[PDB]
Amino acid sequence: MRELARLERPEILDQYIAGQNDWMEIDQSAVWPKLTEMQGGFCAYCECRLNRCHIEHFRPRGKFPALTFIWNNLFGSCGWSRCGIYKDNGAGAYNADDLIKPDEENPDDYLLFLTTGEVVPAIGLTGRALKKAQETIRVFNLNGDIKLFGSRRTAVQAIMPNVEYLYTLLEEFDEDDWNEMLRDELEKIESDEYKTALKHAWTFN
Amino acid sequence: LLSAFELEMCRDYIQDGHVDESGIFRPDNAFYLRRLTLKDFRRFSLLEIKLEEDLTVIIGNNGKGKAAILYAIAKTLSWFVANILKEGGSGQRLSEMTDIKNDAEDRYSDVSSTFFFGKGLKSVPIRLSRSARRDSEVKPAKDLADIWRVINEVNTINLPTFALYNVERSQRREERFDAYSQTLGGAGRFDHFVEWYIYLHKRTTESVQKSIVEKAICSVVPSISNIWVELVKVTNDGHDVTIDQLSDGQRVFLSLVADLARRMVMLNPLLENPLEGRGIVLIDEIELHLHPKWQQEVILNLRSAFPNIQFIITTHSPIVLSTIEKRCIREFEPNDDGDQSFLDSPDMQTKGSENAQILEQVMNVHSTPPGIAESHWLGNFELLLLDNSGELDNHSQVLYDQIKAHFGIDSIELKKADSLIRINKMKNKLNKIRAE
Amino acid sequence: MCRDYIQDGHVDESGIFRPDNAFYLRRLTLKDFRRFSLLEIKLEEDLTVIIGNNGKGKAAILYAIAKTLSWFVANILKEGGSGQRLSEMTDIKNDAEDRYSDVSSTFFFGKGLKSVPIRLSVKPAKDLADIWRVINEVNTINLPTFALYNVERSQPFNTGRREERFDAYSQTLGGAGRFDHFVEWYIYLHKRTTESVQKSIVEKAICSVVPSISNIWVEMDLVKVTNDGHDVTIDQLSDGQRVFLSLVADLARRMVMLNPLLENPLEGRGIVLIDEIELHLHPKWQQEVILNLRSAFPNIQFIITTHSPIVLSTIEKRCIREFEPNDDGDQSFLDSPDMQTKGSENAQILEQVMNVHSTPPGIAESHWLGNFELLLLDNSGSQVLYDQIKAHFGIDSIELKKADSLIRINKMKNKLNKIRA
Ligand SMILES: Nc1ncnc2c1ncn2[C@@H]1O[C@H](COP(=O)(O)OP(=O)(O)OP(=O)(O)O)[C@@H](O)[C@H]1O
Ligand SMILES: [Zn+2]
């Protein structure tokens, strides 16, 4: 995932309190724009373009009724065999603490993306960190889904000639404008799907 | 139309049509199946399918009902042909033993269908049924087939074509109503085609009846350059071959094309170009015994020959799907409980797409065999390479040597490995520069 | 004695029993047969795959080994029994001058019987089959298993049929397994329920090899399966499921009847032919069918035929016999392809092993990524090119993801050229 800044809460959530109000009592269209400004139109868990939009409670409503209307528990997920749907009815016996919440934890500290489209825990992870990354991989089905893997792999390999040729020009110029080129390349990927994998491809480390 | 039948009456309704700028005749009141519904049938509790009037491809894993659908359609179509042939034909019943969902408290099944027949008959509902008392609402089907039969009897009309080319395709014959002889039996009567062709040459209008099916063989089947008879001889792979000496699958595709051409050319005598006749054709495993070089041509050529015939097709070939528009694919969910009520088109456009893309995004299978340990080598090599600052190491060198030996020096995988080495080592040099 | 030459063996570290005097077809030659003027095939001991455009040549081949093995079969069954033979069923090459056709095959039966040359239409195969008959009469031996699975095994669902090991060979080379015979034999074993270990071994073979069927058993008499977690009947199974079931069950029955003395009857020596391994199989099962077979059928020399690249992704390039395109029957010898296929990309297999593109050239959809690349590199990175990229593109589709990357590379190369100047 990407790093996201938890946006200010929409005022529509203040009219509902857990217990006496069902989730369907909330107009979904009244809360979506804030999530859109949060995520830029991409899934919180797999960074795919959102077309089958789905408001997702990071901590499940059934097990966490008190957090049903809490603003920091809402994410705009896609969907289904991946992400939130796999989280509540595909996987099981997991603890929500082990999952990476991409609004208060840096994802790059745990998750590393290869050239081959696979996502593995980052180098040096031990103990709770590796367990965190493993459960984040499993529960959201970040690589076991064939569709997600395939799309991410084909996206990553699409820019590999560019990554090869950018660094080849290292000795061609003074490092200032080369750093400018690298920054410009890091700018575009922000508007594309799976931008964390593309950043892992482009970045120094 | 029904009111006119009770009252040029009903003949122009079936006979009127127009010719496209492409030269393909289009009937004004087109006939095809629109909506198909099953209840407590085999693997389905309830399921509804919407069909196009041009094409429908049904795909999925093993099982899943892709054939079932065709079997149920053919059983429904049997009531049309029976009452076209004779009044009170009584059609065919569902199997009381096999065509009911085993776990169903109703202990009975219904197969519901709706056949669009132009601006007059917007809906011709049909409901075949069976019980382990349940009856069938075949009355409007009987009515429409009776209109066809009676109108043809007073003045001949181009009757609809119905066929089911199942797995069984590979194991007086002069009267146009013989075209309906076991036409839903699961296999074309290729022997009857042989007899019909022999009779045609012995008589040798009938000449154009011969030439039309000959052109169908020559254009649709890629191998057959020419066909004639002494027993039948073919110009197969550039030299003369006997009919029984034809290749497997080559002969099967030949049998499909020839049988359909004969049936359709007998059923539609009044067409200027008979190939443009009405009808519904069901094909199971369209790719059967076909090399991929023929898989990427079979549907295109088949539909170029028979334009306005409504095709319902089952396939397992991602190469075939690469010639099909997104709206025409109908897929099942790979993980379903059987109560999945509908089924819909894919998300990606498959027409013109790469085989590797369709193989993974649509059919949901990895583009490389995950059970082959040699496919994972690039991933392990990449993980090892970055395990120490992205420069080459002895373990990484051993993996590089294994890749070089197994896949080859000119292999794409080795090019990926060496480009990975170059890029990561450079990255490490950039990190060293930034360190100071 | 001579029996020990057949019965001895050794077990691998994997647990697989290996016959030291392994019996397999080593070399095969066809003269004036079907389309071949003179053609030589060298066969692999483990597994061999023939690929090509038309089914005629590959069938021919498998038909030739089936008819050759028929003589072994007949002489195993009846003394001096005449097996199947050509004897001029229009198998002569259609323009051959010799009007004669010989299927020259050289079987290998270990260190001693290094060569057993047979030709049809001298037939010294009796000389070995007489050993296979006289031995197994004085004292039982594990006979070699033979089979052919043609298109005919997709059939819709007269002997003692049972308790006689020679109920095998009954119609094994006919092209279709006797699925009804298997059902009958299963019913009788279930009635009596060594029969128990035969039944359990067969059931384990079905469960392991076939993905869908998790369990199979017989009820009041009728046979039930647990297919896709549902308990249905044999005739309720799909055509693909039933075809795979019939093939695996028929081969397992024949081989468990032919090899009663093995600790695992599933690994006896033999030669099995399969004309269409991918018949009615979803690609998901195509990725697993050969691994499952080879894990369940260790020592058997599989000579199979396929048109499915997904199958070829699981085979080493040494096992392919490839009919190069434009291959007149005058070709002397079939040989392996250059590209290693095992574990390689599917598109690369398509492109270089079967010589057809990854994208169908029959349709363009009124645009084409290659045209965009050609125009972009011609202009070096603009209304016509943007019109091309606006055709259906402008979407996440890979067709746009590659185009935008090439636009970036072209503009970047232009910037490099500007800085260099
Ligand atoms: N009456 C029934 N009750 C319960 N399950 C049934 C019944 N009839 C069929 N089935 C189930 O439906 C399937 C029958 O095959 P199905 O028609 O779905 O496959 P298909 O279209 O022939 O596909 P393929 O040949 O590609 O596997 C099996 O999974 C079987 O268990
Ligand atoms: Zn997602």
Tab-separated table of N, CA, C and O in Angstrom, chain A residues 114-116 123 146-147 150-151 153-154 157 160 164 167-168 170-171 175 178-179 200 203-204, chain B residues 347 357 360-361 364-366 379 382-383 386-387 416 419-420 422-423 426-427 429-430 433-434:
chain	number	residue	atom	x	y	z
A	114	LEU	N	9.095	-6.676	-5.693
A	114	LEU	CA	10.113	-7.095	-6.645
A	114	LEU	C	9.792	-6.615	-8.054
A	114	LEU	O	8.732	-6.051	-8.335
A	115	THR	N	10.749	-6.859	-8.946
A	115	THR	CA	10.520	-6.726	-10.376
A	115	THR	C	9.582	-7.798	-10.910
A	115	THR	O	8.905	-7.569	-11.917
A	116	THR	N	9.498	-8.942	-10.242
A	116	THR	CA	8.736	-10.076	-10.745
A	116	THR	C	7.256	-10.001	-10.399
A	116	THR	O	6.533	-10.972	-10.635
A	123	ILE	N	13.682	-6.320	3.441
A	123	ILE	CA	14.913	-6.938	3.909
A	123	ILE	C	15.218	-6.490	5.330
A	123	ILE	O	15.194	-5.294	5.647
A	146	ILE	N	-4.600	-14.172	-8.681
A	146	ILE	CA	-3.975	-14.215	-9.997
A	146	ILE	C	-4.159	-12.886	-10.716
A	146	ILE	O	-3.234	-12.380	-11.362
A	147	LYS	N	-5.348	-12.289	-10.601
A	147	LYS	CA	-5.626	-11.027	-11.280
A	147	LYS	C	-4.694	-9.924	-10.795
A	147	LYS	O	-4.083	-9.207	-11.597
A	150	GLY	N	-0.954	-10.633	-11.745
A	150	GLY	CA	-0.744	-10.426	-13.160
A	150	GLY	C	-0.745	-8.968	-13.562
A	150	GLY	O	0.149	-8.524	-14.290
A	151	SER	N	-1.733	-8.207	-13.080
A	151	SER	CA	-1.800	-6.792	-13.426
A	151	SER	C	-0.595	-6.034	-12.885
A	151	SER	O	0.009	-5.224	-13.600
A	153	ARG	N	2.416	-7.249	-12.074
A	153	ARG	CA	3.619	-7.667	-12.782
A	153	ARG	C	3.699	-7.021	-14.155
A	153	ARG	O	4.761	-6.543	-14.567
A	154	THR	N	2.584	-6.999	-14.885
A	154	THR	CA	2.616	-6.416	-16.218
A	154	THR	C	2.816	-4.909	-16.151
A	154	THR	O	3.373	-4.310	-17.078
A	157	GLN	N	6.835	-4.498	-15.297
A	157	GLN	CA	7.698	-4.763	-16.444
A	157	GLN	C	7.504	-3.741	-17.554
A	157	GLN	O	8.347	-3.637	-18.451
A	160	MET	N	10.356	-1.100	-16.967
A	160	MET	CA	11.730	-1.550	-16.748
A	160	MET	C	12.740	-1.033	-17.768
A	160	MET	O	13.877	-0.741	-17.358
A	164	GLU	N	16.053	1.007	-16.546
A	164	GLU	CA	17.379	0.662	-17.048
A	164	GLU	C	18.059	1.869	-17.680
A	164	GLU	O	19.255	2.099	-17.479
A	167	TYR	N	19.214	5.218	-15.217
A	167	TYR	CA	20.458	5.122	-14.459
A	167	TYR	C	21.674	4.991	-15.366
A	167	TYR	O	22.787	5.328	-14.951
A	168	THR	N	21.488	4.495	-16.591
A	168	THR	CA	22.602	4.410	-17.528
A	168	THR	C	23.173	5.790	-17.832
A	168	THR	O	24.380	5.931	-18.059
A	170	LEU	N	23.829	8.092	-15.835
A	170	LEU	CA	24.386	8.677	-14.620
A	170	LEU	C	25.618	9.520	-14.923
A	170	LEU	O	25.709	10.682	-14.513
A	171	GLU	N	26.580	8.947	-15.641
A	171	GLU	CA	27.815	9.655	-15.940
A	171	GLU	C	27.665	10.647	-17.082
A	171	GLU	O	28.614	11.383	-17.372
A	175	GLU	N	25.172	15.472	-11.503
A	175	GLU	CA	24.134	14.754	-10.770
A	175	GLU	C	22.915	15.605	-10.431
A	175	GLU	O	21.888	15.039	-10.043
A	178	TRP	N	20.308	15.065	-13.209
A	178	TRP	CA	19.936	13.656	-13.110
A	178	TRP	C	19.006	13.415	-11.927
A	178	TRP	O	18.039	12.650	-12.031
A	179	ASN	N	19.283	14.063	-10.793
A	179	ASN	CA	18.361	14.009	-9.665
A	179	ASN	C	17.021	14.627	-10.035
A	179	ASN	O	15.967	14.161	-9.587
A	200	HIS	N	9.299	1.305	-5.667
A	200	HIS	CA	10.314	0.317	-5.317
A	200	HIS	C	11.228	0.016	-6.495
A	200	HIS	O	12.417	-0.261	-6.306
A	203	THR	N	13.298	3.627	-6.919
A	203	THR	CA	14.038	4.213	-5.808
A	203	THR	C	15.440	3.621	-5.684
A	203	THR	O	15.751	2.556	-6.226
A	204	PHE	N	16.299	4.350	-4.962
A	204	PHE	CA	17.638	3.853	-4.663
A	204	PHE	C	17.585	2.599	-3.800
A	204	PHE	O	18.300	1.625	-4.061
B	347	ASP	N	-14.260	-7.908	-17.378
B	347	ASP	CA	-13.921	-6.503	-17.212
B	347	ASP	C	-12.964	-6.012	-18.290
B	347	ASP	O	-13.073	-4.864	-18.735
B	357	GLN	N	-2.240	-12.265	-21.279
B	357	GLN	CA	-3.151	-11.427	-20.508
B	357	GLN	C	-4.475	-12.139	-20.252
B	357	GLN	O	-4.980	-12.154	-19.126
B	360	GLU	N	-4.556	-15.095	-17.652
B	360	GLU	CA	-4.513	-14.777	-16.231
B	360	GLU	C	-5.656	-13.883	-15.766
B	360	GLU	O	-6.196	-14.100	-14.678
B	361	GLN	N	-6.047	-12.883	-16.556
B	361	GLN	CA	-7.077	-11.951	-16.115
B	361	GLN	C	-8.475	-12.540	-16.258
B	361	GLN	O	-9.359	-12.243	-15.449
B	364	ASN	N	-8.106	-17.078	-15.194
B	364	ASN	CA	-7.583	-17.207	-13.834
B	364	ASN	C	-6.727	-18.478	-13.743
B	364	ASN	O	-7.143	-19.528	-13.259
B	365	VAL	N	-5.560	-18.381	-14.376
B	365	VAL	CA	-4.485	-19.367	-14.269
B	365	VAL	C	-3.173	-18.613	-14.449
B	365	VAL	O	-3.083	-17.705	-15.280
B	366	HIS	N	-2.164	-18.970	-13.651
B	366	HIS	CA	-0.860	-18.325	-13.752
B	366	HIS	C	-0.265	-18.521	-15.139
B	366	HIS	O	-0.398	-19.586	-15.745
B	379	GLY	N	12.656	-15.183	-9.182
B	379	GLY	CA	12.286	-14.548	-7.927
B	379	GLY	C	13.314	-14.763	-6.833
B	379	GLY	O	13.681	-13.824	-6.122
B	382	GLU	N	16.371	-12.695	-7.627
B	382	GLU	CA	16.147	-11.292	-7.297
B	382	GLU	C	16.224	-11.054	-5.794
B	382	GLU	O	16.833	-10.079	-5.341
B	383	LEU	N	15.610	-11.935	-5.005
B	383	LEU	CA	15.658	-11.774	-3.556
B	383	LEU	C	17.084	-11.901	-3.033
B	383	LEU	O	17.493	-11.154	-2.136
B	386	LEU	N	19.265	-8.614	-3.964
B	386	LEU	CA	19.040	-7.476	-3.084
B	386	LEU	C	19.347	-7.787	-1.629
B	386	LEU	O	19.337	-6.870	-0.802
B	387	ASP	N	19.606	-9.052	-1.293
B	387	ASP	CA	19.891	-9.396	0.096
B	387	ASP	C	21.200	-8.781	0.571
B	387	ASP	O	21.388	-8.583	1.777
B	416	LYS	N	16.876	-11.045	-18.359
B	416	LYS	CA	16.292	-10.411	-17.184
B	416	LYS	C	17.253	-10.461	-16.006
B	416	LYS	O	17.427	-9.465	-15.298
B	419	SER	N	20.247	-7.984	-16.628
B	419	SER	CA	19.777	-6.610	-16.488
B	419	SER	C	19.502	-6.275	-15.028
B	419	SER	O	19.775	-5.158	-14.576
B	420	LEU	N	18.958	-7.235	-14.279
B	420	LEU	CA	18.748	-7.054	-12.847
B	420	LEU	C	20.070	-6.824	-12.125
B	420	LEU	O	20.182	-5.926	-11.280
B	422	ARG	N	22.886	-5.641	-13.415
B	422	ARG	CA	23.415	-4.341	-13.816
B	422	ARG	C	22.707	-3.208	-13.083
B	422	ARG	O	23.352	-2.334	-12.484
B	423	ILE	N	21.372	-3.227	-13.105
B	423	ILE	CA	20.595	-2.146	-12.511
B	423	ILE	C	20.844	-2.071	-11.012
B	423	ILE	O	21.072	-0.990	-10.466
B	426	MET	N	24.332	-0.786	-10.140
B	426	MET	CA	24.399	0.638	-10.410
B	426	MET	C	23.732	1.358	-9.264
B	426	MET	O	24.283	2.297	-8.699
B	427	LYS	N	22.537	0.910	-8.911
B	427	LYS	CA	21.837	1.512	-7.778
B	427	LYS	C	22.735	1.571	-6.554
B	427	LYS	O	22.729	2.561	-5.814
B	429	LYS	N	25.967	1.739	-6.569
B	429	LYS	CA	26.950	2.793	-6.811
B	429	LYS	C	26.342	4.174	-6.565
B	429	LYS	O	27.008	5.067	-6.026
B	430	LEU	N	25.069	4.361	-6.935
B	430	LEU	CA	24.396	5.625	-6.643
B	430	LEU	C	24.261	5.844	-5.144
B	430	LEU	O	24.426	6.967	-4.652
B	433	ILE	N	27.577	6.952	-3.853
B	433	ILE	CA	27.813	8.360	-4.172
B	433	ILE	C	27.030	9.262	-3.225
B	433	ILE	O	27.563	10.247	-2.698
B	434	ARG	N	25.759	8.934	-2.981
B	434	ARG	CA	24.945	9.751	-2.084
B	434	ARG	C	25.402	9.635	-0.635
B	434	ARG	O	25.100	10.514	0.179
